[PDB]
């Protein structure tokens, strides 16, 4: 009946849950607490030419 | 209808919950999405950017740009330390208002290694060499170069490349440290010394400045969200 | 039917082993003039062991950082008075009167999200020379007025019919009321900062008050009662969800002065110490 | 019958002068006087001749103080250089039996630039200055509802009270005194002049007649007196002759019929 | 590796002491697409008469200079045909290329930060007050920071340690920026795309971004060296578009 | 943004000698808030001079009235002097015993 089963947040060194949506608007849903994506190079290396970090930065 | 039973925690308002809720504007058509540059997905992306450190936070210079410059001159000064401070990225006065420091003050636990970049801002005719040393906790701060050379150090030579990186590695008995640091979660300290001195030709200034930037490495993480102690009000309308 | 969804856990990078070195590779030398931040790990400067790191950056995600409910408004209103203006509460909607959520949101230039609103209403009996009465439970009405709709003139106005405005009726002793709101803006995102004017001649109003325009809230008692005076207090709580942000900014350093402008009194960069070399002694007998 | 309030505020005041003052008018003559150098209203003692015990004068002191602080706040929203003057006309006027009509207009440096609308309860104009001042007044977060009730429940109530509280002070009616004389002019000409003194109702009609044929009204000058009575004047430059024929006819409410005036 | 050339329109710029080129967020300027537009009329694209280099007037770097700032646009409103197209249209859109120039001998020393801040909303010297449009910008002439607190009237609180925005000046490295170190380079280049929460906007009413130049290490020399050291700024629009043609507005 | 004043000097009661009377100087139609009004008895500036409230008309133009107590005499004259922002030199209006 339109059920979503997904894993729970655990640690490392029965583990999943179930969700059903009841309302007609997507703004009524719960938060998206499980999206983990990264992209630091947008702010840390915004340069036109690549720098390989083992060669001198200039010359 | 269906027989049910109410459990403890019913009819309470917890701030950190997330349940579904009824919408007050049914079938509302939102504006389309625009592709704007500079999207952020994780606060750790901000802490990985360098920012200038106010190392010269002495009395009388708290409101001038001189708070950012480390002075260094020519002549025989091998016995006088250049600078030194504690590694407390969220508690010490020299770090708590930087980007990394301001991000950490929203959390309670931190872990990972740090990067300190140093740039020399003298003339092109000046030369010199410096020793940058990090000491893990367990003893007092080194009071000479002979003592400082025993820890994790780098010898920086000034040339065409003007910047040198000192990486402070994660060396701890626990997996995390407190942003509000005590004796038990100490991290050590950092010091700077002359390795050979500064030599200039005739016609150049004899005094120079060094600047320091701080950032986090790619093994850095924080946890246990909390409120920050820097902002406050006494009434509404502020 | 049931559909399985997979969630990818993202952990930090490991530490690789490295040994001695003598070569022309110079990872520790760079130039900050390029505007580029160096990417060097301890493996490039010292000798390191190999570590399998399991730590996760899950609590620093934007969703987990902003999806917390905080107070944004607090107000009072009476059941009976001689003013006819203290009998209801009303205000314009914005997250700029309380400094915590304001500072948290102002870390970014553009924001876009849905909202979850929760109200906390508490009543009390005013001090007086003669107490003692038998009053039924109080009921409260909350009305949201979009920009352009008519305004109530009193607590007995026809406008309370809420024929098209959304409204909430709540009785004391029950769970707090709560409702969801979608992203309601004429632009593509909300703006915390606006460096412009309202009029094409470069004058008028400067700043944020040119782009808010999102309605008001009114709150009243529905009993019209209480031979003895009582007082109610309402607190509002916002909680964004399904969030996106753009163009990070440096955090606010000076204290806030008002809700409309960004004016400030100049402050110091940080606090002082004894010298540029001073470190306190902690290992003493 | 209409109750009105003239409010004036200046940005750079002269030494010894108030920065904000109000005058109240119950029809043709004044009954109130307020300023910021004192902070309280003062009657004329000629409308009710009875000091209402702190319930009519401590009631107006408060809203006048509110208007004072509002008008003084209205100057910190203007980024311009030169000095400023803010004028306001606020009041009401009762209809046939009920349903008072309100009035609220404002002027900046002598130009009407904004007003107050009731269905939204907001100040509004079209200039940039109007929008700036209206925004600053609305950030006061209680000012809209207070003026909104000032114009629909306070001034009509005060008007209905005033219409029967000093009713004898509404039938002020005095017959004006005529002084028609003549004086020389340029060679060949002479200026007649007919005046009228101490007439309570402001309406008054004058005209010039040669013998029985009207020769015009001339130029009517009007001036108040220091007690509420009025002074009117009319003059006409004619030939040196016929000066013993003219008879200015004056009609007034305090006159039973248009008395003729003779030199 | 340190020589560079940039050609736009009928203008070209060369350098022999370049560090690199910063692209603000990894995004180059682009034209507006069909699936993200809102205005229905056909736009105009001059494409060579507006996309070229304009040079502002120079400032004099002295021993004690707090810094300077310009606002964009409204600094190029009198620059050839890019300014004329601004007066006749209601909506406009463009990216930019910024080039800052300052040279000195190998016996001088100093360090400048060159940063572009999107939507630099500024605060007044009187906390309960308002700023002027003249207090925010002067077209081609630069505004000046101060060393202490300013009092003035309707002016910007321009002490340099707060950057007129109430933040720490040492954190401005979060924005797209470069440094000019008198011992390393003599020029800085920043390529900026169009950044806004709407697809197009009016150019007279909204300052899109502010360019700030701040010396962190003061200038210094000794006893026979040149004392006059100027700084020059040169800006070029890219992918300019306009909509809403009518009679020319006036200020 | 400037309006030059308009002066009218007159008397309350008719001007026959020996009888107490009120001399009035009425200025109207000027839009600064500041103006200098004085009374003169053949140039002699009258000391005891009272004023009225500074109100305005519906065209947002100010008016003010000074009043003094006197008695008419065939010999002496009366005048009203005014200095104003619009006036290069102060205007002196001589009182007519008829207007």
CB contact under 8 A, A47 and C3: no
- Give me the residue spans of the domains in chain B: 1-238
Please give the DSSP secondary-structure letter assigned to residue E248: P
The residue count of chain C comes to 285
Give the residue numbers in B contacting E (CB under 8 Å), as ranges: 32, 34-38, 46, 49-54, 63-65, 68-69, 97-99, 102, 119, 121-125, 160, 162, 203-205, 207-209, 211, 213
Are C110 and E25 within 8 A, CB to CB? Answer: no
Which B residues 163-202 touch C at CB under 8 Å? 163-167, 169-170, 175, 183, 186, 189
C-alpha–C-alpha distance, residues B221 and C55, integer Å: 7
Are C59 and B222 within 8 A, CB to CB? Answer: yes
Q: Which residue of E has its CA nearest to A40?
A: E25
Q: Which residue of D has its CA nearest to C210?
A: D135
Q: In the complex, which subunits touch F with 3 or more CB pairs below 8 angstroms?
A: D
Give the one of B23, B27, B160 whose C-beta lies nearest to A59's C-beta: B160
Strand (E) positions, chain B? 39-40, 51-52, 70-73, 83-86, 109-111, 114-120, 127-135, 152-157, 163-168, 177-178, 189-199, 207-216, 221-223
C-alpha–C-alpha distance, residues E238 and E224, integer Å: 43
C-alpha–C-alpha distance, residues E82 and C138, integer Å: 65
C-alpha–C-alpha distance, residues D91 and D105, integer Å: 10
Strand (E) positions, chain A? 3-7, 16-19
Helix (H, G, I), strand (E, B) or coil at C73: strand
Closest among E98, E49, E91 to E75, alpha carbons compared: E98
Strands E187-192, E22-23: parallel, antiparallel or unpaired by DSSP? parallel
CB contact under 8 A, B19 and A30: yes
According to DSSP, the residues that pair with C121 across neighbouring strands are C234
C-alpha–C-alpha distance, residues E214 and E18, integer Å: 19
Give the one of C37, C39, C242 whose C-beta lies nearest to A32's C-beta: C242
Closest among F77, F81, F96, F97 to F5, alpha carbons compared: F81
Chain A closest CA to C71's CA: distance in Å? Answer: 19
Chain E closest CA to D63's CA: distance in Å? Answer: 24
Residue showing tokens 């006048």: D64
- Give me the residue spans of the domains in chain F: 1-99
Helix (H) or strand (E) holding C86: none
Residue showing tokens 């009575």: D229
* HSE-up (13 A, CA, CB side) for residue F11: 25
Joined tokens for residue E127: 């906390």
Interface test with B, best of E170, E194, E199, E227 (most B CBs within 10 A): E170
Q: How far is CA A4 from CA A25, B22, C3, C5, C9, in A?
A: 17, 20, 5, 7, 18
**Pairs across D and E, CB distance < 8 A:** 13
| Cβ neighbours of B201 (radius 10 Å) | 10
The residue count of chain A comes to 59
C-alpha–C-alpha distance, residues B41 and B24, integer Å: 29
Joined tokens for residue E32: 């507006």
Chain F residues whose CB is inside 8 A of the D197 CB are 12-14
Helix (H) or strand (E) holding C71: strand C70-78
Q: At what angle do helices D58-73 and D128-138 cross, to 10 degrees?
A: 130
Chain F closest CA to D192's CA: distance in Å? Answer: 10
Breaks (C-N over 2.5 A) in chain F follow: none
According to DSSP, the residues that pair with F7 across neighbouring strands are F27
C68 Cβ neighbours under 8 A, 6+ residues apart: B15, B16, B225, C239
E46 touches chain B (CB under 8 A): no
Strands F62-70, F79-83: parallel, antiparallel or unpaired by DSSP? unpaired
Does the N-terminal peptide bond of residue B223 adopt cis geometry, omega within 30 degrees of 0?
Answer: no
Q: Which residue of B has its CA nearest to C28?
A: B165
Chain B closest CA to A15's CA: distance in Å? Answer: 19
C-alpha–C-alpha distance, residues E195 and E192, integer Å: 8
CB contact under 8 A, E21 and A48: yes
Chain D residues whose CB is inside 8 A of the C148 CB are 120
Q: Going edge to edge, which strands form the sheet with B189-199?
A: B83-86, B189-199, B127-135, B152-157
Give the one of E25, E108, E225 whose C-beta lies nearest to B38's C-beta: E25
Helix (H) or strand (E) holding C44: none
CB contact under 8 A, C199 and D120: no
Which E residues 174-203 touch A at CB under 8 Å? 174, 176, 184, 191
Cα-atom radius of gyration of chain C, to the nearest Å?
A: 28
DSSP string, C178-208: EEEE----SSSSEES---BBSSTTS-S-BSG
Which D residues 109-138 touch C at CB under 8 Å? 119-121, 128-129, 131-132, 135
C-alpha–C-alpha distance, residues D252 and D173, integer Å: 10
CB contact under 8 A, E170 and C269: yes
Which A residues 23-52 touch C at CB under 8 Å? 25, 27-38, 43-47, 51
Q: How far is CA A25 from CA B25, C165, E7, F55, in A?
A: 9, 19, 52, 61
DSSP string, C47-69: ----B----B--TTBHHHHH---
Rounded to a whole number of angstroms, the distance between the first and last alpha carbons of chain D is: 38
DSSP string, chain D: --EEEEEEEESSPPTTS-SEEEEEEESSSEEEEEETTT-S-B--SSSS-S--TTTSSHHHHHHHHHHHHHHHHTTTT---SS--EEEEEEEEE--SSS--EEEEEEEETTEEEEEEETTTTEEEESSHHHHHHHHHHHTTSSHHHHHHHIIIIIHHHHHHHHHTTSGGGG----PPEEEEEEEE-STTEEEEEEEEEEESSS--B--EESSSSEEE----EEEE-TTS-EEEEEEEEEESSSTTT---B-B-TTSSS--B---
Q: Phi and psi of B64, rounded to 5°? A: -125, 165
Joined tokens for residue D263: 């030199």
Helical ranges in F1-99 per DSSP H: none
Chain E residues whose CB is inside 8 A of the C251 CB are 167-168, 171
Chain D closest CA to E129's CA: distance in Å? Answer: 5
CB contact under 8 A, E132 and D78: no
Closest among D253, D146, D252 to D205, alpha carbons compared: D252
C247 Cβ neighbours under 8 A, 6+ residues apart: B36, B37, B38, C108, C109, C110, E118, E195
């Amino acid at each position: 009946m339109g059920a979503q089963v997904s894993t729970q947040k655990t640690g490392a060194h029965i583990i999943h849950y179930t969700n059903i949506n009841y309302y007609k608007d997507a703004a009524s849903n719960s938060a998206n607490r499980q999206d983990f994506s990264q992209d630091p190079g947008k702010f840390t290396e915004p340069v036109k030419d690549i720098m390989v970090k083992s060669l001198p930065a200039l010359n | 209808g269906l027989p049910v039973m109410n459990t403890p925690g019913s009819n309470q308002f917890l701030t950190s919950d997330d349940f579904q809720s009824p919408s007050a504007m049914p079938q509302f058509d939102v504006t389309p999405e625009l592709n704007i540059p500079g999207e952020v997905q994780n606060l750790m992306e901000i802490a990985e950017v360098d920012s200038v450190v106010p190392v010269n936070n002495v009395e009388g210079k708290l409101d001038t740009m001189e708070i950012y410059r480390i002075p260094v001159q020519s002549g025989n000064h091998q016995s006088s330390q250049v600078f030194g401070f504690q590694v407390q990225p969220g508690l010490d006065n020299v770090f708590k208002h930087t980007l990394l420091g301001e991000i950490l003050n929203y959390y309670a636990h931190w872990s990972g290694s740090i990067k300190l970049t140093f740039v020399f801002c003298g003339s092109a005719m000046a030369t010199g060499k410096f020793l940058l040393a990090y000491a893990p906790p367990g003893a007092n701060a080194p009071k000479s170069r002979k003592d400082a050379m025993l820890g994790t150090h780098i010898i920086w030579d000034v040339g065409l490349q003007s910047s040198c990186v000192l990486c402070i590695p994660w060396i701890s008995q626990t997996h995390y440290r407190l942003v509000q640091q005590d004796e038990y979660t100490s991290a050590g300290n950092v010091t700077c010394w002359y390795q050979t001195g500064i030599v200039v030709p005739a016609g150049t200034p004899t005094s120079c400045s060094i600047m320091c930037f701080v950032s986090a490495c790619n093994d850095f993480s924080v946890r246990l969200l909390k409120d920050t102690p820097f902002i406050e009000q006494s009434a509404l309308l502020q | 039917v049931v559909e399985a969804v997979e969630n990818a856990v993202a952990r930090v990078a490991d530490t690789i082993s490295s040994g001695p070195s003598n070569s022309q590779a110079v990872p520790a030398l760079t130039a900050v003039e390029t505007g580029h931040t160096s990417q060097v790990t301890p493996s490039d400067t010292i000798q390191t062991r190999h570590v399998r790191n399991y730590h996760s950056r899950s609590e620093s995600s934007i969703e987990n950082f902003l999806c917390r409910s905080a107070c944004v408004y607090m107000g009072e209103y009476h059941t009976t008075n001689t003013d006819t203006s203290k009998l209801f509460a009303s205000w314009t909607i914005n997250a700029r009167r309380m400094v915590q959520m304001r500072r948290k949101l102002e870390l970014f230039t553009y924001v876009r999200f849905d909202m979850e609103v929760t109200f906390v209403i508490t009543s009390k009996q005013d001090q007086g020379t003669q107490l003692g009465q038998d009053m039924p439970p109080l009921t409260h009405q909350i009305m949201y007025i979009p920009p352009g709709g008519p305004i109530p003139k009193s607590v007995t106005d026809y406008t309370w019919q809420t024929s098209t405005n959304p409204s909430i009726f709540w009785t004391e002793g029950n769970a707090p009321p709560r409702m969801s709101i979608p992203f309601i803006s004429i632009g593509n995102a909300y703006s915390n900062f606006y460096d412009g004017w309202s009029h094409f001649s470069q004058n008028g109003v400067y700043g944020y008050n040119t782009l808010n325009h999102m309605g008001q809230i009114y709150v009243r008692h529905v009993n019209g009662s209480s031979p003895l005076p009582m007082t109610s207090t309402v607190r509002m709580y916002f909680k964004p969800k399904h969030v996106k942000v753009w163009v990070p900014r440096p955090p606010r350093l000076c204290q806030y002065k008002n809700a409309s402008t960004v004016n400030f009194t100049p402050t110091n960069i940080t606090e002082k110490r004894q010298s540029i070399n001073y470190i306190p002694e902690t290992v003493k007998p | 019958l209409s109750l009105l309030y003239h409010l004036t505020a200046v940005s750079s005041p002269a030494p010894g002068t108030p920065a904000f003052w109000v005058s109240g008018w119950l029809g043709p003559q004044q009954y109130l006087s307020y300023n910021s150098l004192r902070g309280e209203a003062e009657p004329c003692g000629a409308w009710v001749w009875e000091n209402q015990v702190s319930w009519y004068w401590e009631k107006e002191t408060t809203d006048l103080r509110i208007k004072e602080k509002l008008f003084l706040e209205a100057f910190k929203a203007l980024g311009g250089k030169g000095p400023y003057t803010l004028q306001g006309l606020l009041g009401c006027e009762l209809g046939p039996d009920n349903t008072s009509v309100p009035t609220a207009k404002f002027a900046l440096n002598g130009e009407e630039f904004m007003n107050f609308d009731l269905k939204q309860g907001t100040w509004g104009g079209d200039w940039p200055e109007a929008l700036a001042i209206s925004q600053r007044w609305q950030q006061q977060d209680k000012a809209a509802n207070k003026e909104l009730t000032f114009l629909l429940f306070s001034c009509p109530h005060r008007l209905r009270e005033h219409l029967e509280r000093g009713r004898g002070n509404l039938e002020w009616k005095e017959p004006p005194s005529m002084r028609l004389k003549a004086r020389p002019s340029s060679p060949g000409f002479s200026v007649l002049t007919c005046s009228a003194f101490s007439f309570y109702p402001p309406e008054l009609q004058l005209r010039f007649l040669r013998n029985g044929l009207a020769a015009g009204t001339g130029q009517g000058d009007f001036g108040p007196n220091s007690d509420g009575s009025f002074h009117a004047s009319s003059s006409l430059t004619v030939k040196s002759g016929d000066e013993h024929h003219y008879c200015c006819i004056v009609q007034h409410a305090g006159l039973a019929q248009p008395l003729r005036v003779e030199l | 590796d340190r020589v560079r050339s940039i050609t736009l329109g009928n203008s070209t710029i060369t350098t022999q002491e370049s560090a690199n080129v910063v692209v603000a967020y990894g995004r180059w300027p682009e034209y507006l697409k069909d699936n993200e537009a809102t205005a229905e009329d056909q736009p105009t694209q001059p494409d060579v008469a507006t996309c070229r280099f304009y040079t502002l007037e120079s400032v004099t770097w002295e021993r004690d200079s707090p810094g300077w700032w310009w606002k964009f646009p409204d600094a190029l409103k009198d620059m050839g045909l890019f300014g004329q197209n601004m007066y006749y249209h209601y909506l406009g859109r463009a990216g930019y290329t910024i080039h800052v120039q300052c040279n000195a001998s190998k016996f001088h020393q100093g360090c400048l930060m060159v940063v572009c801040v999107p939507e630099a909303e500024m605060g007044c010297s009187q906390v309960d007050g308002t700023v002027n449009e003249h207090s925010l910008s002067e077209g081609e002439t630069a505004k000046k920071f101060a060393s202490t607190s300013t009092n003035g009237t309707n002016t910007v609180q321009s002490i340099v340690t707060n950057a007129g925005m109430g933040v720490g000046v040492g954190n401005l490295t979060i924005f797209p920026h470069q440094w000019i170190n008198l011992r390393t380079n003599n020029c800085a280049t920043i390529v900026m795309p169009y950044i806004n929460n709407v697809p197009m906007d009016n150019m007279f009413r909204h300052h899109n971004f502010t360019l700030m130049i701040i010396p962190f290490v003061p200038l210094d020399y000794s006893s026979d060296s040149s004392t006059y050291v100027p700084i020059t700024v040169t800006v070029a629009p890219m992918c300019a578009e306009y909509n809403g043609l009518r009679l020319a507005t006036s200020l | 943004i400037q309006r030059t004043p308009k002066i009218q000097v007159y008397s309350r009661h008719p001007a026959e000698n020996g009888k107490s009377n009120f001399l009035n100087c009425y200025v109207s139609g000027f839009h600064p808030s500041d103006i200098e009004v004085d009374l003169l008895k053949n140039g002699e500036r009258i000391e005891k001079v009272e004023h009225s409230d500074l109100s305005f008309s519906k065209d947002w133009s100010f008016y003010l009235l000074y009043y003094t107590e006197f008695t008419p005499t065939e010999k002496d004259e009366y005048a009203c002097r005014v200095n104003h922002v619009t006036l290069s030199q102060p205007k002196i209006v001589k009182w007519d015993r008829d207007m």
